[PDB]
């Protein structure tokens, strides 16, 4: 049911994510899963004409985070939070990349 989020693109490489963000603006982003390692996810985010990539970390107690101070029970909660405040990211997560 992750796939039902507009921002969740499933398995996508780092370089393919950059292609999917070529058409983006500041705050264009997507969440991707590794094509090599199941369950390992990243956020790719466009800002000032450059793409930045952030590992989604899993803490020892299962919480998810991109920034250590801000940990979440679910990936959707993490994305909703960082859509409002950058909190370690270079900018906020505002515009889900169209899926291709």
């Amino acid at each position: 049911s992750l796939e039902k989020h507009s921002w969740y693109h499933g398995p996508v490489s780092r370089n393919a994510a950059e292609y999917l963000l070529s058409s983006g603006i500041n705050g264009s982003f997507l969440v991707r899963e590794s094509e090599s390692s199941p369950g390992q996810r990243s956020i790719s985010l466009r800002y000032e004409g450059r793409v930045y990539h952030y590992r989604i970390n899993t803490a020892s107690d299962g919480k998810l985070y991109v920034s250590s101070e801000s940990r979440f029970n679910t990936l959707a909660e993490l994305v909703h939070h960082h859509s409002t405040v950058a909190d370690g990211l270079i900018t906020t997560l505002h515009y889900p990349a169209p899926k291709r």
Partner: protein
């Protein structure tokens, strides 16, 4: 699932496009339109359209080229509402 909706090429020549879209009910501050050659990893251009408008003209295009055209409602709550910006491809 997209905002805006019904992004269409209304009229075209080999070097220009008139595009239209259907605005969301919620007032939009302005729109940002990007366009670039499909498959390009860079090169894309961008411009702004007032939030009261729902058409734009894209000029200075190359004949025969497939463009990816995307319209963003700037500041619209895409993540909260689970929507995405709308995109189409159009050749020439």
């Amino acid at each position: 699932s997209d905002v805006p909706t019904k992004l269409e090429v209304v009229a075209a020549t080999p070097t220009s496009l008139l595009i239209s879209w259907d605005a969301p009910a919620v007032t939009v501050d302005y729109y940002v339109i990007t366009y670039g050659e499909t498959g390009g990893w860079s090169g894309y251009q961008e411009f702004e359209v007032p939030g009261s408008k729902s058409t734009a003209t894209i000029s200075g295009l190359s004949p025969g080229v497939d463009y990816t055209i995307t319209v963003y409602a700037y500041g619209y709550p895409y993540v909260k509402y689970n929507k995405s910006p709308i995109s189409i491809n159009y050749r020439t």
